[PDB]
Amino acid sequence: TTGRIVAVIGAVVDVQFDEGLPPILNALEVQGRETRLVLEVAQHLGESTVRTIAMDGTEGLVRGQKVLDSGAPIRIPVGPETLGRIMNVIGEPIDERGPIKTKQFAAIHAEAPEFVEMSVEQEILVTGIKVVDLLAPYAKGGKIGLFGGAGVGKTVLIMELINNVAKAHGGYSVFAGVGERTREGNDLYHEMIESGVINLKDATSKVALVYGQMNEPPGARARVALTGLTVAEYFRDQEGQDVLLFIDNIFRFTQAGSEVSALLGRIPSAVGYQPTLATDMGTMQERITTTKKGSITSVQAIYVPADDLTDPAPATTFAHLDATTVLSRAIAELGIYPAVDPLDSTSRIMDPNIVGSEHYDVARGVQKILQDYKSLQDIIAILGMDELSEEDKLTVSRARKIQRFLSQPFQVAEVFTGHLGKLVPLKETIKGFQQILAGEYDHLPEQAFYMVGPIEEAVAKADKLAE
Amino acid sequence: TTGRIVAVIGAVVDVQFDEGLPPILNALEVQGRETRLVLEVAQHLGESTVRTIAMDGTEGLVRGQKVLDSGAPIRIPVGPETLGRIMNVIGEPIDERGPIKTKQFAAIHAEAPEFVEMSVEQEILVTGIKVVDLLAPYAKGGKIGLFGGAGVGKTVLIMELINNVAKAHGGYSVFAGVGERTREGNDLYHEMIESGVINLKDATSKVALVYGQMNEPPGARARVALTGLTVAEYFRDQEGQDVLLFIDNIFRFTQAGSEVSALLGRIPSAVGYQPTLATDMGTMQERITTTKKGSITSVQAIYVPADDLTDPAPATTFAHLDATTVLSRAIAELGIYPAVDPLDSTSRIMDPNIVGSEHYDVARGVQKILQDYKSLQDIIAILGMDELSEEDKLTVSRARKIQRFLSQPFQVAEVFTGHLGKLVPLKETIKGFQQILAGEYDHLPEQAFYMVGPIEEAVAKADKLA
Amino acid sequence: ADTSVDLEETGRVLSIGDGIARVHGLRNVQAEEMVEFSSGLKGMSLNLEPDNVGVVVFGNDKLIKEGDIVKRTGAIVDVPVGEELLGRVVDALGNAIDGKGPIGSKARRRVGLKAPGIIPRISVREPMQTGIKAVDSLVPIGRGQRELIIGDRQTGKTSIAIDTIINQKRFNDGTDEKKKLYCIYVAIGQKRSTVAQLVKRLTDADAMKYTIVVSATASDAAPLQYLAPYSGCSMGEYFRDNGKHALIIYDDLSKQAVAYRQMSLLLRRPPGREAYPGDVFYLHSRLLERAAKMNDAFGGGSLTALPVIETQAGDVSAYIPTNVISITDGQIFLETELFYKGIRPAINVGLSVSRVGSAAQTRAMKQVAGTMKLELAQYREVAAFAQFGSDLDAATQQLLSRGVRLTELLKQGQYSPMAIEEQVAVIYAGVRGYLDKLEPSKITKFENAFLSHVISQHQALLGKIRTDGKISEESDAKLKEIVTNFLAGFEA
Ligand SMILES: Nc1ncnc2c1ncn2[C@@H]1O[C@H](COP(=O)(O)OP(=O)(O)OP(=O)(O)O)[C@@H](O)[C@H]1O
Ligand SMILES: Nc1ncnc2c1ncn2[C@@H]1O[C@H](COP(=O)(O)OP(=O)(O)O)[C@@H](O)[C@H]1O
Ligand SMILES: Nc1ncnc2c1ncn2[C@@H]1O[C@H](COP(=O)(O)OP(=O)(O)O)[C@@H](O)[C@H]1O
Ligand SMILES: *N(C(=O)NC1CCCCC1)C1CCCCC1
Ligand SMILES: [Mg+2]
Ligand SMILES: [Mg+2]
Ligand SMILES: [Mg+2]
């Protein structure tokens, strides 16, 4: 069937069909263009006219321009041939290395795995990051979310995790760049070539790359996430072998949707979002999951507008996760990195029956001394410290030490800390936090605990601080 | 040719023209009215119809009533003939003294001076008011803004400034009442006759009046400022001299526009304001300026809705000023007048290479101790001063003495305060503040510094304290 | 027989109001195509609807009437571009407004071109020295980076960008062509007299010769203020793509967003959060992505951007501000409280950042500033907490001592950007501990004298640090000898 553009407003394009009317979600190819311009059918307005969202800029389009129905939703390359390659929203290579010679293609819109396909198994995935491993440990094949306002550490954390988990990883990885920094994509790409995680010469690449950054119009940012998870699904199902899936940043999927919502004719919901925020999010998120056929360990960076976690975007995201790592500006501002909020990060596996009561109790003990200090803070800032008991102030000093022992020099962060990166074993984390709680370090100065790895370095720094 | 009214809603009137449509900004004359009713074309709606804004009451208009195209925008009288006279939005005399017989008329709309016409000479204008001269000095031919919430002192301040600058000015002045009190217009008019700046018997008048007060409909209030500034533009160029332009209150311009916008079909912007808020203000403010041809020293009183400086109206106004005097309700309640916030008032002239390093350093010094005191006030609110370090007690003390020395009795407020007004010379202002900062008066009681002129009066008062 | 007014290449105004013309015809017009009104006035086709074209006017709309003729240009909006714009002041469309005549540019460029993708780029690594100690050490900028300058009115935002422009004169008058850096100052929504003072400031400093000034002031129509930023960015891409380096300042984007909101609402696009178009983020993300570092295969040139955002009541956490922060490669946050206490530049260290880090610094600067940012963050935390009279161990007392001294060394006056080897020299004296016993109120006087000293008598040391781009064991040994001795004399 052939159509004719009857209207253009930004990324939203109305096309008219004399005969066959393409169904919602079908991909239409615009004729007369230097580069492939795809339109996705969103609605049937009536009178043989459909409303669509463009997957690239609409500058240059004219009313009356011809449009062809491909007779299906956007279909992209999937399989071993995508490894080491970079694709865009519509599965075209963007690494200037030629065609992606795959034997199969797959639609980026798919039904989510059924309830009978779910898995309940859950095992610890140690990261080497003290706060995470201790307070809200991640799980193999589980859903992990990293929340954070602008510039608090989301990306640095995901890059560190890729470094500590995906290099060792024997399966395959998928990284989806969704409405983020193009510079970050060129960064990551050369980073991975160096680590040999990506190989341009042989066929030993272990990671597939998909990108649609903030330089692209909304249609592309609204579907690139689907593109990336579509690649991941093939590895999970058509190979079973373990898959890692990293998304920076999936909020951008929701923001893209809101950029065009009013143009799509919707009445705004609260805070200027599309009335379909939750359902839009559900049909996408329910695809990012481990199943009986295979496992997917997902790590998604989640933007928090105006630093307000009650914002509908981030707020509707908590329900799709197994482990939440919440990052705070108030903590980053203090030089504490990673800026994890110890009183707002959680894990479904933080249970004595899963991690052992030693792990559980120390974590729980750390949370208690911190909530207690926090509740104390404003009081002593006014009446001073002198009114506290010797024990009440002994917790004030350990609380501050513990808060400092949660900070950590990331390997990936060397260019920022001026410190050599550090990786701490789980047992060493528990031990260290346990000892401080027990009082075995009340004589060392606070700064000894700041920006170090294992508790030994705290002792050694204290020595380096003495004289 | 003639057109006809097809619709009327408040100040908004639609008119159809079968032949020859009148361009945007043109002035139309409604027929069958006892007094001149002008309609200003705002837009071409289509189907030979135009949407316009009335400059006066629309009661009595009927669908079908005839409307005439005057062939140009509102034009008013300009020149020496406006001096001592009072006019309204559309150039009509409202002082009952007969016709204004000028040889020149001018449209109240016009493009703002071009970039190549801007001036870059920076020269101070000493007001004799301590806070202003020290911390955020005014500049000859610069733009001055006076921000203030309800009844905090904007009018008193602009009047003191007229009393301290306009009187001792060789050139002419223009005062524009925009959406304010009519009886304030009556007081001003009689005050200027008394002082001789206005003369109804000779040609010595030095001030021209333009009024469109809070009794006027939106369209009028939305345009009176253009009218006032148009009179000042003439004196600026068509005489090549120095002009003073006083306006109370330019906020009313934006508020009036907000009233008609609600009827022009626009989708509302934040806080219900017109979407064109910034550009409406821009094409108007950019005309209030000094050029290479002549200078305009402007003083605009700026109202602050609900005392919220982040309100779009005020917040958008900051960008148009060379000096900003922000009045504070909390300061006024402390008895300190003028109620100027010493830390939120700025001047593009506060530069060592302009005012000198001594003046520059004394201002930075005052603001430094005021800010340090401010940072303490939080801890003082609960426990008080008695809990401060013997050192913080000291910054507190000097700070509080400085806050009061910034205060000063006005000549124009004598009629109700009962205190002789004061005018302190800039050299005397720097010195006084230097001495307090250096500690030379740590032994003088606070109250000695409140509501006086020069430093010597503080010591004297500290003596009458026996 | 007269076919000059067909409805494919021409149209007629259906209605006109508030810079929006609704046009009948123009059947063959392209989305985002420039069109022209009978009046000589230009406009842009944004809304392509079945019965009309929605046109945005680039000038005073009072000149347009119902029925006027509108003509296609066949060209997507673009502007003049090249070196002929250096030393000139132009409007949003590229027209001269400085009264020095026509710009004889020999090339043009689309204002909406998409930013370079992954392949054409390469990691940011070349220093973009502002010449401001606090910036160059704590939040370093590299060529092709984007770094936001944000803060309430009058906190010092414009000043950082001006000094930064003036600073390049070292390299622009130099012989090393690779070090050159052309500047672009985009003025949006400002007052014309303010822009004139500005260009007079740059002329006096002799920086106007390497700068392009793009001005869409307060009385310029909304669409003109909306375009301005994209126009100057294209002028910047000319350098970026022709093996050179350019620096762009958008002062400011708060006002550009207000104009976008105006134009968008008048086009009847339903308002979003805070009355802004639901796509304000994309307005700015799109623009700033255009600042980039190109790889050698692509000429190796670059475009660096310093956007400006004005906060309300020091609220960096609001919507507009977090949007833009979420785009840039860092931000410089300034607060009025610090500005008044004497901390100028008024930078808040914990809240500012650089996403490029030491990779944008010379080895020398990294050798003295490497751990200083985190340390100064911890210093401010403990300083607030110690006010609680609590007993302080030697460790915290030393941190306080060190923090208060460094705070003084990062103070800096205006209009005198420092050479990198000179910043390295003064940073060194503090970070190495030599000033821990000097009264804090003396640190500014010390620095002024120490610096004139090394510049007067130690040009070789300064020159070696600059040439090697590092502090050798030898250079290190000589600095120690200089500071200890000079200090002793100073405290005599
Ligand atoms: N390092 C500095 N030392 C002293 N004064 C400074 C310094 N930097 C800026 N200033 C002064 O602070 C004042 C405000 O500076 P500036 O105009 O750059 O701030 P802004 O954030 O751009 O304000 P605006 O709202 O006017 O745009 C000016 O008088 C300027 O000279
Ligand atoms: N773990 C860390 N250690 C040191 N600095 C960090 C760390 N995480 C973030 N930062 C600093 O904060 C900046 C912003 O972090 P980033 O991960 O890019 O934020 P976002 O959450 O916005 O993606 C980094 O470029 C760096 O300067
Ligand atoms: N300089 C001043 N000295 C004494 N009282 C003042 C001064 N300025 C204002 N006030 C007090 O505040 C009142 C309101 O001042 P006014 O200028 O009329 O308010 P507004 O800011 O609304 O224009 C005055 O009547 C007087 O009581
Ligand atoms: N860099 C990073 O993950 N890449 C390198 C780090 C050193 C070891 C090899 C991989 C990060 C990318 C995001 C910003 C911070 C640095
Ligand atoms: Mg990020
Ligand atoms: Mg008043
Ligand atoms: Mg500025």
Short mmCIF file of C-alpha atoms in Angstrom, two decimals, chain A residues 8-10 58-61, chain C residues 13 16 18-23 26 29-37 40-49 52-59 61 64 70-79 92-93 109-113 221-228 230-231 256 260 263-264 267 269 283 286 290:
data_model
loop_
_atom_site.label_atom_id
_atom_site.label_comp_id
_atom_site.label_asym_id
_atom_site.label_seq_id
_atom_site.Cartn_x
_atom_site.Cartn_y
_atom_site.Cartn_z
CA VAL A 8 3.57 17.27 9.93
CA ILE A 9 3.99 18.70 13.45
CA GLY A 10 7.45 18.02 14.90
CA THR A 58 11.13 15.40 9.97
CA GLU A 59 12.77 18.50 8.47
CA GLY A 60 12.35 18.42 4.68
CA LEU A 61 9.04 16.53 4.63
CA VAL C 13 -1.90 34.86 4.88
CA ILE C 16 -1.73 36.88 11.58
CA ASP C 18 1.49 37.32 17.89
CA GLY C 19 4.26 36.35 15.48
CA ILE C 20 2.17 33.51 14.09
CA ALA C 21 0.98 33.56 10.47
CA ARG C 22 -1.50 30.93 9.26
CA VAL C 23 -0.91 30.46 5.53
CA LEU C 26 2.39 26.63 0.00
CA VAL C 29 6.62 23.75 1.34
CA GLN C 30 8.91 21.65 3.54
CA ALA C 31 8.75 21.31 7.33
CA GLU C 32 11.25 23.81 8.75
CA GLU C 33 11.62 25.62 5.42
CA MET C 34 12.31 29.35 5.35
CA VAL C 35 9.55 31.38 3.68
CA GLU C 36 9.27 35.09 2.88
CA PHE C 37 6.52 37.65 3.39
CA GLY C 40 10.74 41.37 3.06
CA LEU C 41 10.24 39.64 6.43
CA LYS C 42 11.27 36.00 6.81
CA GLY C 43 9.48 33.18 8.62
CA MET C 44 9.73 29.44 9.21
CA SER C 45 7.25 26.66 8.46
CA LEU C 46 6.74 24.67 11.66
CA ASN C 47 3.17 23.36 11.47
CA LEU C 48 2.20 21.54 8.26
CA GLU C 49 -1.57 21.02 8.54
CA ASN C 52 -2.88 25.69 6.40
CA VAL C 53 0.81 26.16 7.14
CA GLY C 54 1.68 27.49 10.63
CA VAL C 55 4.46 30.06 10.17
CA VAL C 56 6.77 31.53 12.79
CA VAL C 57 7.89 35.07 11.97
CA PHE C 58 11.47 36.27 12.40
CA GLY C 59 10.71 39.95 13.02
CA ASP C 61 4.71 40.94 12.60
CA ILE C 64 1.94 41.38 7.81
CA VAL C 70 4.03 34.22 1.06
CA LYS C 71 6.83 32.66 -1.01
CA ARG C 72 8.80 29.44 -0.66
CA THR C 73 12.61 29.72 -0.58
CA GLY C 74 13.12 26.02 -1.07
CA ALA C 75 15.69 26.06 1.75
CA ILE C 76 15.65 24.66 5.29
CA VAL C 77 16.61 27.44 7.73
CA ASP C 78 20.34 28.20 7.63
CA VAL C 79 22.82 31.02 8.38
CA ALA C 92 20.06 35.61 15.05
CA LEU C 93 19.90 35.34 11.26
CA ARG C 109 25.09 26.10 7.26
CA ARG C 110 21.80 24.65 8.49
CA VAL C 111 20.89 25.66 12.04
CA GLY C 112 19.33 22.27 12.82
CA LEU C 113 21.99 19.74 11.79
CA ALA C 221 10.72 38.52 18.50
CA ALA C 222 10.37 35.19 20.28
CA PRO C 223 11.38 33.02 17.32
CA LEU C 224 14.50 35.14 16.90
CA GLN C 225 15.50 34.46 20.50
CA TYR C 226 14.69 30.77 20.01
CA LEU C 227 16.93 30.48 16.96
CA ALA C 228 19.92 32.48 18.23
CA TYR C 230 21.27 27.24 17.03
CA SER C 231 22.64 29.94 14.73
CA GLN C 256 15.66 30.95 25.42
CA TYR C 260 10.39 28.71 23.10
CA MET C 263 6.25 30.53 20.40
CA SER C 264 5.04 27.00 21.22
CA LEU C 267 1.21 27.73 17.93
CA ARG C 269 0.83 23.23 21.24
CA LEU C 283 15.23 21.84 23.10
CA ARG C 286 19.86 18.66 20.88
CA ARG C 290 26.56 19.64 18.93
#
